[PDB]
Amino acid sequence: TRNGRDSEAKRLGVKRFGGESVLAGSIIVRQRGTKFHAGANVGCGRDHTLFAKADGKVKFEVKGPKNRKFISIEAE
Amino acid sequence: AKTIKITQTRSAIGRLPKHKATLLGLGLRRIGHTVEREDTPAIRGMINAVSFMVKVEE
Amino acid sequence: MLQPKRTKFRKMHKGRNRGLAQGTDVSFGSFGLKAVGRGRLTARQIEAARRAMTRAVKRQGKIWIRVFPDKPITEKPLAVRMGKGKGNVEYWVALIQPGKVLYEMDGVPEELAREAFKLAAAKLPIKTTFVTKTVM
Amino acid sequence: DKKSARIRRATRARRKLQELGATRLVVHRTPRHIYAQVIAPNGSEVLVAASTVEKAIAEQLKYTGNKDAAAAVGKAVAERALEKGIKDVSFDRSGFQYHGRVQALADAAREAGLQF
Amino acid sequence: MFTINAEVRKEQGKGASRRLRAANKFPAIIYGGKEAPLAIELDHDKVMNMQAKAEFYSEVLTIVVDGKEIKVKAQDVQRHPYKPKLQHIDFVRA
RNA sequence: UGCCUGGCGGCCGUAGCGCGGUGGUCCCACCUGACCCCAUGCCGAACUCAGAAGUGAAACGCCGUAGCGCCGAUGGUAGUGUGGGGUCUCCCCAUGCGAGAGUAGGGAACUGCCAGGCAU
RNA sequence: GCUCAACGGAUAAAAGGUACUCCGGGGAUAACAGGCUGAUACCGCCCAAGAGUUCAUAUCGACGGCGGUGUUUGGCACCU
RNA sequence: UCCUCCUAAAGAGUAACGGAGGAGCACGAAGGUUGGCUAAUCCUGGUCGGACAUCAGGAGGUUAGUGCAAUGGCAUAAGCC
RNA sequence: CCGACUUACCAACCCGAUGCAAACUGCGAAUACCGGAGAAUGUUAUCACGGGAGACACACGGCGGGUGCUAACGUCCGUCGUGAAGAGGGAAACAACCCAGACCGCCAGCUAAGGUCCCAAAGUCAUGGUUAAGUGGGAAACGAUGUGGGAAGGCCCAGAC
Ligand SMILES: [Mg+2]
Numbered sequence: 001t002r003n004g005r006d007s008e009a010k011r012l013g014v015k016r017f018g019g020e021s022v023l024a025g026s027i028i029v030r031q032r033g034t035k036f037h038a039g040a041n042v043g044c045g046r047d048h049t050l051f052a053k054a055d056g057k058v059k060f061e062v063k064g065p066k067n068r069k070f071i072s073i074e075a076e
Numbered sequence: 077a078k079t080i081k082i083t084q085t086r087s088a089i090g091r092l093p094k095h096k097a098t099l100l101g102l103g104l105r106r107i108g109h110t111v112e113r114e115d116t117p118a119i120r121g122m123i124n125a126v127s128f129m130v131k132v133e134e
Numbered sequence: 135m136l137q138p139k140r141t142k143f144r145k146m147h148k149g150r151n152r153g154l155a156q157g158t159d160v161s162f163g164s165f166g167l168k169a170v171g172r173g174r175l176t177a178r179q180i181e182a183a184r185r186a187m188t189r190a191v192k193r194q195g196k197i198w199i200r201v202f203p204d205k206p207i208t209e210k211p212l213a214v215r216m217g218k219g220k221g222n223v224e225y226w227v228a229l230i231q232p233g234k235v236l237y238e239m240d241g242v243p244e245e246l247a248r249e250a251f252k253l254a255a256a257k258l259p260i261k262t263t264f265v266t267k268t269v270m
Numbered sequence: 271d272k273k274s275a276r277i278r279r280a281t282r283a284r285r286k287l288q289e290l291g292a293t294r295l296v297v298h299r300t301p302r303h304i305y306a307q308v309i310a311p312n313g314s315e316v317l318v319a320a321s322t323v324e325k326a327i328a329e330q331l332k333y334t335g336n337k338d339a340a341a342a343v344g345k346a347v348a349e350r351a352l353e354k355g356i357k358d359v360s361f362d363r364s365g366f367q368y369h370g371r372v373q374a375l376a377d378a379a380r381e382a383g384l385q386f
Numbered sequence: 387m388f389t390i391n392a393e394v395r396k397e398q399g400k401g402a403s404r405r406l407r408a409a410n411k412f413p414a415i416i417y418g419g420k421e422a423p424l425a426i427e428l429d430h431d432k433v434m435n436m437q438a439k440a441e442f443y444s445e446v447l448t449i450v451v452d453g454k455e456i457k458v459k460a461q462d463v464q465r466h467p468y469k470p471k472l473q474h475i476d477f478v479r480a
Numbered sequence: 481u482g483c484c485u486g487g488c489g490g491c492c493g494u495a496g497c498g499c500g501g502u503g504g505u506c507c508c509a510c511c512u513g514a515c516c517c518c519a520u521g522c523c524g525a526a527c528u529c530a531g532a533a534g535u536g537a538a539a540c541g542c543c544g545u546a547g548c549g550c551c552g553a554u555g556g557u558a559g560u561g562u563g564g565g566g567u568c569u570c571c572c573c574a575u576g577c578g579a580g581a582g583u584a585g586g587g588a589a590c591u592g593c594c595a596g597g598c599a600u
Numbered sequence: 601g602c603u604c605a606a607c608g609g610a611u612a613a614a615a616g617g618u619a620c621u622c623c624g625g626g627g628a629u630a631a632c633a634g635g636c637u638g639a640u641a642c643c644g645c646c647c648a649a650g651a652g653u654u655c656a657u658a659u660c661g662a663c664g665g666c667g668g669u670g671u672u673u674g675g676c677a678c679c680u
Numbered sequence: 681u682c683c684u685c686c687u688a689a690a691g692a693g694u695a696a697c698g699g700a701g702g703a704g705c706a707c708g709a710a711g712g713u714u715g716g717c718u719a720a721u722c723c724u725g726g727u728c729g730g731a732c733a734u735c736a737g738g739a740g741g742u743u744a745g746u747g748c749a750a751u752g753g754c755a756u757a758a759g760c761c
Numbered sequence: 762c763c764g765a766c767u768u769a770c771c772a773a774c775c776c777g778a779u780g781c782a783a784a785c786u787g788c789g790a791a792u793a794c795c796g797g798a799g800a801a802u803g804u805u806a807u808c809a810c811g812g813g814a815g816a817c818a819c820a821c822g823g824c825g826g827g828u829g830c831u832a833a834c835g836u837c838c839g840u841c842g843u844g845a846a847g848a849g850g851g852a853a854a855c856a857a858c859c860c861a862g863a864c865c866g867c868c869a870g871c872u873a874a875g876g877u878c879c880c881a882a883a884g885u886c887a888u889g890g891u892u893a894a895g896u897g898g899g900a901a902a903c904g905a906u907g908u909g910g911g912a913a914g915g916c917c918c919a920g921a922c
Pocket residue numbers: 150151152154155
């Protein structure tokens with residue numbers, strides 16, 4: 001009985017979803033994976049985090065020749 | 077408005093707060109409480125969802 | 135004694151085996167044993183039933199086995215509380231799959247097949263039924 | 271193999287400019303000919319298509335696929351870009367290196383109307 | 387050649403299947419090539435006895451559904467995992 | 481208005497692999513020199529520039545094939561509450577909810593802009 | 601100036617014995633002692649190739665298991 | 681104290697004594713803006729060289745690699761100059 | 762020294778097959794989490810602030826982990842619920858098990874599990890019954906010619922056990 005560890009969970013995963021407004025500066029998703037990427041009007045930080053430069057009702061889709069899940073932006 | 081008649085036959089005592097607020101919004105407060113709502117798809121779905129602790133008569 | 139050469143990890147969860155099973159159909163042999171209910175087949179039990187079927191067939195035909203004691207269960211050696219972490223590795227089994235063929239027989243008559251499968255019922259605590267390979 | 275290798279080499283830059291959404295001056299040279307365009311920020315519509323396969327450009331240049339013809343095409347395409355009213359582009363070398371025919375044609379575009 | 391009396395199952399579903407199994411009825415479906423998919427409810431023990439024959443998955447049978455003969459043949463099967471019940475029996479038109 | 485050829489959007493394996501055949505008018509690259517602009521942790525091999533003697537071997541493009549991966553059938557399906565129960569290590573009754581698994585069944589693409597050869 | 605290493609950090613600076621002991625509380629929480637469950641101490645009950653000269657169906661029984669005495673070994677954590 | 685996974689009810693997080701592996705940084709180049717390349721593995725041949733050092737065809741493409749324990753990321757590649 | 766032949770042996774690896782999961786998801790989920798466009802409903806059940814609290818010691822009926830023995834009036838558990846805060850209502854007696862929400866009396870009506878031989882306050886009906894079990898009213902894997910049946914089958918007044 002010497003192996004009962006786990007992380008101080010960092011509270012990752014999608015936080016501000018498609019259909020929720022983006023206040024000036026707000027993120028869309030915090031994650032340790034690029035599972036949802038910077039498609040149209042979105043960008044990335046330093047430590048595998050991605051904050052969207054564009055506001056409004058966010059758009060979920062799947063694109064890429066690798067069947068990848070992105071995060072794009074609508075016209076709100 | 078097409079009011080269709082509704083009746084409570086039991087309460088949301090042993091039941092989830094979902095059912096508690098269901099009876100509360102329907103106005104159903106006690107045993108046999110006899111109410112007069114108006115029917116739409118929303119209320120019809122409510123009927124189907126909690127048709128076990130309530131009883132609707134036409 | 136059927137037992138893995140190596141396992142993925144030394145212990146594993148106690149596990150769940152509910153609902154319906156997937157070993158419904160017969161795959162390798164002519165004559166099989168069904169277990170509708172639920173339980174566990176120890177490695178000792180599986181080896182014993184294989185040896186007994188060899189005994190009955192007089193080394194005529196072949197034997198087949200589907201489930202394996204790949205899961206080393208940790209029971210607790212007696213007189214130890216729930217605490218002190220998880221228990222200790224003690225033995226190996228596979229659990230009972232509703233519809234599963236456990237042991238298989240071929241080259242011998244149906245009468246000897248049902249005899250040996252009733253003897254599997256008399257070397258196992260599990261509920262039985264006599265099955266054969268299905269036409270398509 | 272050159273075409274596939276160059277396309278993979280250029281995927282990052284082409285997708286980068288497509289997603290940036292600034293209309294990009296595109297080039298693709300070949301030893302014998304070359305095609306030069308001006309393409310929309312997303313890439314769904316061109317603006318000016320000028321190449322050494324055009325009648326006048328082909329007959330006013332002695333060799334089709336050479337750096338001098340590339341420079342002439344750069345002059346012509348950037349001046350037609352001024353005629354239509356093209357001012358701001360962000361360069362896309364399309365996976366090549368910025369030297370040779372591409373460098374001379376790009377300098378021609380700079381002289382004849384595109385700011386880069 | 388077996389001539390089997392079967393009917394049209396108006397409404398299907400899992401609860402329908404449970405009540406039909408209570409009332410001794412198990413389904414099957416007619417299909418094959420371009421024809422319209424129709425599905426039937428069968429007479430259980432009759433079908434079990436008729437498919438106990440060696441020729442059920444080989445020969446050209448005949449189905450009486452709504453007063454008409456239909457020529458079909460076996461394609462596939464599903465079975466009750468741990469009971470002698472054929473969960474499904476499959477028909478390709480002849 | 482149509483085939484071939486190139487520069488870029490719509491699908492991102494019903495596109496994608498494979499095998500049977502076709503193109504040098506325009507056309508890609510192979511290819512002549514690489515003394516040059518420019519490169520090698522050795523070679524103009526690679527890139528490239530002044531040229532078109534030839535080129536379709538590899539490649540690109542197009543048709544045929546459902547031989548693979550994929551799509552999804554319809555029956556059928558466990559499980560989620562919800563109220564009822566038991567044969568309570570787990571199974572069943574009235575519904576809403578509903579996966580997969582595969583299968584009889586389809587697809588090699590399809591689509592668009594601009595221009596070069598080709599003729600109204 | 602932090603192996604203040606327990607590191608949201610009681611101080612700049614800190615180990616033990618009590619059967620000679622004492623106070624306030626607890627069935628929160630343990631033990632003789634005091635219930636549910638039944639893996640197992642241990643007992644009852646599972647065929648039939650065979651030690652059993654062959655032989656199943658006699659000490660009997662190998663490769664191979666369930667209820668239980670609640671009676672033991674245990675599990676839980678309470679009624680006290 | 682602080683780390684990699686399932687758990688914990690397909691956002692989240694969720695236990696100690698619910699299985700496995702660790703640190704008290706290092707690189708001023710293992711870096712960045714800007715120029716490049718893309719694995720692992722096995723068959724064939726060759727003086728060394730043997731299954732594998734190195735060279736020369738072919739088969740697969742992230743099954744290679746991550747600076748660590750490892751997950752999730754990553755071809756545009758943070759993987760390799 | 763390259764070696765010639767075969768041999769109820771093992772299996773790389775691909776095909777015809779068997780697989781598998783807490784630490785794999787080329788599959789896909791459900792209620793819903795997050796939300797964004799509506800009928801009615803809800804004595805405003807949401808937010809901000811200021812005065813004061815308890816507890817940091819919740820149990821049993823409907824789910825998946827370690828557990829444990831696929832045990833428990835079992836647990837750290839994530840949880841709806843009743844109780845807690847509610848007596849009363851049946852349970853042999855035992856809040857939760859099936860309810861139900863009492864503000865107080867009056868020897869007053871439509872009412873929910875337990876419900877309807879006696880104790881006993883509720884039915885000793887008409888149609889089907891069924892059964893030697895006293896089933897109900899507790900021990901399991903095991904079975905064995907008990908027995909309502911129901912369907913299918915094979916010999917058959919040219920002889921069936
Ligand atoms: Mg299972």
